[PDB]
Ligand binder design. Structure first.
Ligand SMILES: *[C@@H]1O[C@H](CO)[C@@H](O)[C@H](O)[C@H]1NC(C)=O
Ligand SMILES: *[C@@H]1O[C@H](CO)[C@@H](O)[C@H](O)[C@H]1NC(C)=O
Ligand SMILES: *[C@@H]1O[C@H](CO)[C@@H](O)[C@H](O)[C@H]1NC(C)=O
Length: 291
Protein backbone atom coordinates (compact mmCIF):
# COMPACT_ATOMS: atom_id res chain seq x y z
CA UNK A 1 0.00 0.00 0.00
CA UNK A 2 -1.12 2.72 -0.56
CA UNK A 3 -3.25 2.43 -3.70
CA UNK A 4 -5.32 5.01 -5.58
CA UNK A 5 -8.68 3.34 -6.24
CA UNK A 6 -10.64 6.29 -7.67
CA UNK A 7 -9.59 9.15 -9.93
CA UNK A 8 -12.12 9.73 -12.71
CA UNK A 9 -11.72 11.87 -15.79
CA UNK A 10 -14.14 14.77 -15.73
CA UNK A 11 -15.78 16.93 -18.34
CA UNK A 12 -16.98 20.38 -17.37
CA UNK A 13 -18.01 23.58 -19.17
CA UNK A 14 -16.57 27.09 -19.19
CA UNK A 15 -17.93 29.15 -16.25
CA UNK A 16 -19.25 26.02 -14.55
CA UNK A 17 -17.95 24.04 -11.58
CA UNK A 18 -16.22 20.73 -11.23
CA UNK A 19 -15.02 18.62 -8.32
CA UNK A 20 -12.10 16.26 -8.76
CA UNK A 21 -12.04 13.36 -6.31
CA UNK A 22 -9.15 11.06 -5.40
CA UNK A 23 -9.56 8.03 -3.11
CA UNK A 24 -6.69 5.83 -1.87
CA UNK A 25 -6.63 2.62 0.15
CA UNK A 26 -3.63 1.73 2.28
CA UNK A 27 -2.10 1.36 5.73
CA UNK A 28 -1.42 3.62 7.28
CA UNK A 29 -4.23 5.60 5.62
CA UNK A 30 -2.28 7.74 3.08
CA UNK A 31 -2.11 11.51 2.76
CA UNK A 32 -3.38 12.85 -0.57
CA UNK A 33 -1.86 15.74 -2.48
CA UNK A 34 -3.09 17.35 -5.74
CA UNK A 35 -0.74 18.55 -8.48
CA UNK A 36 -1.69 20.57 -11.55
CA UNK A 37 0.53 19.12 -14.29
CA UNK A 38 0.87 22.09 -16.67
CA UNK A 39 2.74 24.17 -14.10
CA UNK A 40 3.56 21.72 -11.29
CA UNK A 41 1.39 23.72 -8.87
CA UNK A 42 0.37 21.98 -5.65
CA UNK A 43 -2.94 22.02 -3.81
CA UNK A 44 -3.52 20.96 -0.22
CA UNK A 45 -6.37 21.48 2.23
CA UNK A 46 -6.32 24.96 3.76
CA UNK A 47 -3.59 26.12 1.40
CA UNK A 48 -5.78 28.97 0.09
CA UNK A 49 -6.13 30.25 -3.47
CA UNK A 50 -5.03 33.43 -5.20
CA UNK A 51 -7.98 33.95 -7.55
CA UNK A 52 -10.05 31.98 -5.02
CA UNK A 53 -11.50 29.69 -7.69
CA UNK A 54 -9.69 26.59 -6.49
CA UNK A 55 -9.82 24.80 -3.15
CA UNK A 56 -8.92 21.35 -1.81
CA UNK A 57 -10.82 19.46 0.92
CA UNK A 58 -9.78 16.37 2.85
CA UNK A 59 -6.25 15.07 3.30
CA UNK A 60 -6.26 11.36 4.14
CA UNK A 61 -7.92 8.59 2.18
CA UNK A 62 -10.03 10.96 0.11
CA UNK A 63 -9.54 14.49 -1.20
CA UNK A 64 -11.62 16.83 -3.38
CA UNK A 65 -10.26 19.49 -5.68
CA UNK A 66 -13.04 22.04 -6.29
CA UNK A 67 -12.79 24.52 -9.18
CA UNK A 68 -15.48 27.16 -9.56
CA UNK A 69 -15.86 29.55 -12.53
CA UNK A 70 -14.00 27.14 -14.80
CA UNK A 71 -11.59 28.76 -17.28
CA UNK A 72 -10.31 27.16 -20.47
CA UNK A 73 -6.84 27.36 -18.95
CA UNK A 74 -7.97 24.83 -16.27
CA UNK A 75 -7.92 22.21 -19.00
CA UNK A 76 -5.50 19.29 -18.93
CA UNK A 77 -3.89 16.80 -16.58
CA UNK A 78 -4.17 16.78 -12.80
CA UNK A 79 -2.15 14.40 -10.65
CA UNK A 80 -3.13 12.69 -7.44
CA UNK A 81 -0.38 11.64 -5.05
CA UNK A 82 -1.17 9.11 -2.33
CA UNK A 83 1.55 8.66 0.27
CA UNK A 84 1.84 6.81 3.54
CA UNK A 85 5.13 6.09 5.31
CA UNK A 86 5.48 2.89 3.30
CA UNK A 87 4.15 4.47 1.12
CA UNK A 88 3.78 5.98 -2.36
CA UNK A 89 1.56 6.04 -5.48
CA UNK A 90 0.48 8.53 -8.13
CA UNK A 91 -2.21 8.66 -10.81
CA UNK A 92 -3.40 11.13 -13.42
CA UNK A 93 -6.76 12.23 -14.72
CA UNK A 94 -7.74 14.71 -17.42
CA UNK A 95 -10.12 17.62 -17.11
CA UNK A 96 -11.96 18.15 -20.39
CA UNK A 97 -13.48 21.62 -20.69
CA UNK A 98 -16.29 22.33 -23.14
CA UNK A 99 -17.40 25.77 -24.30
CA UNK A 100 -19.32 27.76 -26.90
CA UNK A 101 -17.17 28.39 -29.99
CA UNK A 102 -14.69 31.24 -29.69
CA UNK A 103 -13.41 33.32 -32.60
CA UNK A 104 -9.67 33.56 -32.77
CA UNK A 105 -8.75 35.27 -36.02
CA UNK A 106 -5.89 37.80 -35.89
CA UNK A 107 -7.76 39.94 -38.37
CA UNK A 108 -11.43 40.84 -38.74
CA UNK A 109 -11.07 43.84 -41.04
CA UNK A 110 -9.99 43.23 -44.63
CA UNK A 111 -9.06 45.65 -47.41
CA UNK A 112 -9.28 45.23 -51.18
CA UNK A 113 -9.48 47.07 -54.45
CA UNK A 114 -12.41 46.74 -56.76
CA UNK A 115 -11.81 43.83 -59.10
CA UNK A 116 -9.40 41.84 -56.94
CA UNK A 117 -9.82 38.49 -55.22
CA UNK A 118 -9.53 38.15 -51.47
CA UNK A 119 -9.90 35.39 -48.91
CA UNK A 120 -11.48 36.14 -45.57
CA UNK A 121 -10.48 33.73 -42.87
CA UNK A 122 -12.84 32.81 -40.02
CA UNK A 123 -10.93 30.91 -37.32
CA UNK A 124 -12.80 29.11 -34.60
CA UNK A 125 -11.79 27.17 -31.54
CA UNK A 126 -14.54 25.18 -29.89
CA UNK A 127 -15.04 22.05 -27.87
CA UNK A 128 -16.76 20.09 -29.16
CA UNK A 129 -15.94 21.01 -32.83
CA UNK A 130 -18.37 23.59 -34.21
CA UNK A 131 -20.20 23.92 -37.48
CA UNK A 132 -19.05 27.15 -39.10
CA UNK A 133 -20.99 29.21 -41.64
CA UNK A 134 -20.54 32.46 -43.47
CA UNK A 135 -23.56 34.74 -43.89
CA UNK A 136 -24.40 38.13 -45.32
CA UNK A 137 -27.45 39.47 -43.54
CA UNK A 138 -29.62 36.39 -43.10
CA UNK A 139 -28.41 34.69 -46.26
CA UNK A 140 -26.02 31.76 -45.93
CA UNK A 141 -23.10 31.91 -48.37
CA UNK A 142 -22.50 31.16 -51.08
CA UNK A 143 -25.92 32.20 -52.35
CA UNK A 144 -27.46 30.48 -55.36
CA UNK A 145 -27.45 33.65 -57.45
CA UNK A 146 -23.72 34.40 -57.14
CA UNK A 147 -20.74 33.35 -59.23
CA UNK A 148 -17.91 34.94 -57.23
CA UNK A 149 -18.15 33.39 -53.78
CA UNK A 150 -16.80 30.08 -52.46
CA UNK A 151 -16.13 28.62 -49.03
CA UNK A 152 -13.31 26.36 -47.93
CA UNK A 153 -13.55 24.48 -44.65
CA UNK A 154 -10.72 22.97 -42.56
CA UNK A 155 -11.77 22.05 -39.02
CA UNK A 156 -10.98 25.23 -37.09
CA UNK A 157 -11.03 27.48 -40.14
CA UNK A 158 -13.55 28.50 -42.79
CA UNK A 159 -12.34 30.66 -45.67
CA UNK A 160 -14.67 32.86 -47.64
CA UNK A 161 -13.29 33.47 -51.12
CA UNK A 162 -14.50 36.56 -52.98
CA UNK A 163 -13.12 36.53 -56.51
CA UNK A 164 -13.22 39.06 -57.83
CA UNK A 165 -14.85 41.76 -55.68
CA UNK A 166 -17.53 44.09 -57.00
CA UNK A 167 -18.76 47.07 -55.00
CA UNK A 168 -21.74 45.32 -53.39
CA UNK A 169 -19.27 42.75 -51.96
CA UNK A 170 -17.99 45.36 -49.52
CA UNK A 171 -19.63 45.71 -46.14
CA UNK A 172 -20.31 43.39 -43.22
CA UNK A 173 -20.02 39.61 -43.12
CA UNK A 174 -21.18 37.37 -40.32
CA UNK A 175 -19.33 34.18 -39.40
CA UNK A 176 -21.40 31.85 -37.21
CA UNK A 177 -20.21 28.88 -35.17
CA UNK A 178 -22.34 26.44 -33.27
CA UNK A 179 -21.91 23.44 -30.97
CA UNK A 180 -24.20 21.85 -28.38
CA UNK A 181 -23.05 24.52 -25.87
CA UNK A 182 -24.27 27.44 -27.99
CA UNK A 183 -24.14 29.53 -31.14
CA UNK A 184 -21.72 32.43 -31.43
CA UNK A 185 -20.89 34.78 -34.25
CA UNK A 186 -18.25 37.27 -35.26
CA UNK A 187 -18.64 40.04 -37.79
CA UNK A 188 -15.97 40.71 -40.42
CA UNK A 189 -15.46 43.83 -42.49
CA UNK A 190 -14.40 44.06 -46.11
CA UNK A 191 -13.57 47.69 -46.91
CA UNK A 192 -12.85 49.26 -50.32
CA UNK A 193 -9.23 50.40 -50.19
CA UNK A 194 -6.83 52.61 -52.18
CA UNK A 195 -3.19 53.13 -51.10
CA UNK A 196 -1.19 50.30 -49.53
CA UNK A 197 -1.01 49.80 -45.81
CA UNK A 198 2.23 50.48 -43.89
CA UNK A 199 5.22 48.14 -44.37
CA UNK A 200 6.62 46.83 -41.11
CA UNK A 201 9.38 44.92 -39.38
CA UNK A 202 12.10 46.96 -41.02
CA UNK A 203 15.62 45.89 -40.08
CA UNK A 204 19.16 46.63 -41.20
CA UNK A 205 20.58 43.24 -42.20
CA UNK A 206 23.90 44.31 -43.70
CA UNK A 207 25.95 47.27 -42.52
CA UNK A 208 29.27 48.87 -43.36
CA UNK A 209 30.87 52.33 -43.29
CA UNK A 210 29.09 53.61 -46.37
CA UNK A 211 26.35 51.12 -47.10
CA UNK A 212 23.50 49.24 -45.51
CA UNK A 213 20.86 46.76 -46.56
CA UNK A 214 17.40 47.35 -45.22
CA UNK A 215 14.81 44.60 -45.17
CA UNK A 216 11.12 44.79 -44.35
CA UNK A 217 7.77 42.99 -44.55
CA UNK A 218 5.16 43.88 -47.14
CA UNK A 219 1.83 44.99 -45.77
CA UNK A 220 -0.40 41.94 -46.16
CA UNK A 221 -3.70 42.89 -47.78
CA UNK A 222 -4.11 39.18 -48.50
CA UNK A 223 -4.01 40.15 -52.15
CA UNK A 224 -6.71 42.80 -52.04
CA UNK A 225 -4.39 45.78 -52.41
CA UNK A 226 -1.55 45.92 -54.95
CA UNK A 227 1.98 47.15 -54.23
CA UNK A 228 3.93 48.59 -57.14
CA UNK A 229 7.12 49.62 -55.32
CA UNK A 230 8.48 50.84 -51.99
CA UNK A 231 9.85 54.31 -51.12
CA UNK A 232 12.73 54.11 -48.68
CA UNK A 233 13.45 57.44 -46.93
CA UNK A 234 16.78 57.86 -45.18
CA UNK A 235 17.97 60.86 -43.12
CA UNK A 236 20.87 61.72 -40.87
CA UNK A 237 19.38 62.54 -37.45
CA UNK A 238 20.48 66.18 -37.33
CA UNK A 239 19.75 66.75 -41.00
CA UNK A 240 16.56 68.02 -42.62
CA UNK A 241 16.52 66.42 -46.03
CA UNK A 242 15.10 62.94 -46.52
CA UNK A 243 16.98 61.12 -49.25
CA UNK A 244 14.64 58.86 -51.23
CA UNK A 245 15.51 55.47 -52.70
CA UNK A 246 12.89 53.53 -54.70
CA UNK A 247 12.91 49.74 -54.51
CA UNK A 248 13.13 47.52 -57.58
CA UNK A 249 9.42 46.75 -57.93
CA UNK A 250 7.97 44.68 -55.09
CA UNK A 251 11.40 43.71 -53.66
CA UNK A 252 11.40 44.09 -49.86
CA UNK A 253 15.12 44.63 -49.56
CA UNK A 254 16.93 47.77 -50.66
CA UNK A 255 20.62 48.59 -50.58
CA UNK A 256 21.58 52.03 -49.29
CA UNK A 257 24.72 53.60 -50.70
CA UNK A 258 26.89 56.66 -50.11
CA UNK A 259 26.58 56.84 -46.35
CA UNK A 260 29.03 58.52 -43.98
CA UNK A 261 31.00 56.28 -41.61
CA UNK A 262 30.06 56.42 -37.90
CA UNK A 263 26.82 58.24 -38.67
CA UNK A 264 23.34 57.85 -37.20
CA UNK A 265 20.48 57.56 -39.71
CA UNK A 266 16.68 57.39 -39.54
CA UNK A 267 15.03 55.12 -42.03
CA UNK A 268 11.34 54.74 -42.94
CA UNK A 269 9.52 52.81 -45.67
CA UNK A 270 6.21 53.32 -47.46
CA UNK A 271 4.46 51.25 -50.10
CA UNK A 272 3.17 52.82 -53.31
CA UNK A 273 0.56 51.74 -55.85
CA UNK A 274 -1.56 53.32 -58.57
CA UNK A 275 -3.81 55.15 -56.11
CA UNK A 276 -0.84 56.61 -54.23
CA UNK A 277 1.47 56.15 -51.26
CA UNK A 278 0.43 54.66 -47.90
CA UNK A 279 1.71 55.39 -44.40
CA UNK A 280 5.35 55.08 -43.47
CA UNK A 281 6.58 52.33 -41.23
CA UNK A 282 7.63 53.33 -37.75
CA UNK A 283 11.01 55.10 -38.05
CA UNK A 284 14.06 52.93 -37.22
CA UNK A 285 17.54 54.10 -36.21
CA UNK A 286 20.83 52.65 -37.38
CA UNK A 287 24.45 53.72 -37.22
CA UNK A 288 27.05 52.96 -39.86
CA UNK A 289 30.41 51.45 -38.92
CA UNK A 290 33.32 53.80 -38.08
CA UNK A 291 36.40 53.80 -40.32
C1 LIG B 1 -9.05 9.66 -19.06
O1 LIG B 1 -8.76 10.44 -20.21
C2 LIG B 1 -7.64 10.01 -20.97
C3 LIG B 1 -7.53 10.84 -22.24
O2 LIG B 1 -7.71 12.21 -21.96
C4 LIG B 1 -7.74 8.54 -21.34
O3 LIG B 1 -6.53 8.14 -21.94
C5 LIG B 1 -8.04 7.66 -20.14
O4 LIG B 1 -8.28 6.34 -20.54
C6 LIG B 1 -9.28 8.19 -19.43
N1 LIG B 1 -9.62 7.36 -18.28
C7 LIG B 1 -9.06 7.50 -17.07
C8 LIG B 1 -9.95 7.27 -15.89
O5 LIG B 1 -7.87 7.80 -16.91
C1 LIG C 1 -8.40 31.34 -51.07
O1 LIG C 1 -8.23 30.12 -50.39
C2 LIG C 1 -8.33 29.03 -51.29
C3 LIG C 1 -8.45 27.70 -50.54
O2 LIG C 1 -7.28 27.40 -49.82
C4 LIG C 1 -7.18 29.06 -52.29
O3 LIG C 1 -7.39 28.09 -53.28
C5 LIG C 1 -7.18 30.40 -53.01
O4 LIG C 1 -6.08 30.47 -53.91
C6 LIG C 1 -7.22 31.56 -52.02
N1 LIG C 1 -7.44 32.78 -52.75
C7 LIG C 1 -6.91 33.96 -52.43
C8 LIG C 1 -7.78 35.15 -52.72
O5 LIG C 1 -5.79 34.11 -51.95
C1 LIG D 1 -24.89 36.45 -37.35
O1 LIG D 1 -25.68 35.30 -37.58
C2 LIG D 1 -26.27 34.78 -36.41
C3 LIG D 1 -27.01 33.49 -36.76
O2 LIG D 1 -27.87 33.77 -37.84
C4 LIG D 1 -27.25 35.79 -35.83
O3 LIG D 1 -27.84 35.24 -34.67
C5 LIG D 1 -26.51 37.08 -35.53
O4 LIG D 1 -27.39 38.09 -35.07
C6 LIG D 1 -25.78 37.55 -36.78
N1 LIG D 1 -25.03 38.76 -36.52
C7 LIG D 1 -25.38 39.92 -37.07
C8 LIG D 1 -25.04 41.17 -36.34
O5 LIG D 1 -25.96 39.98 -38.15
Amino acid sequence: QPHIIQLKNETTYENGQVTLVCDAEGEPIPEITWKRAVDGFTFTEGDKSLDGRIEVKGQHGSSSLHIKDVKLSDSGRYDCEAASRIGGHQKSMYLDIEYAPKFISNQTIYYSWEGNPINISCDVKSNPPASIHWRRDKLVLPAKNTTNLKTYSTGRKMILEIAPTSDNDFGRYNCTATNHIGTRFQEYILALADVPSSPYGVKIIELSQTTAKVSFNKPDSHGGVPIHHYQVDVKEVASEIWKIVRSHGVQTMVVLNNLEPNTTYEIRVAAVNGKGQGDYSKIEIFQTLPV
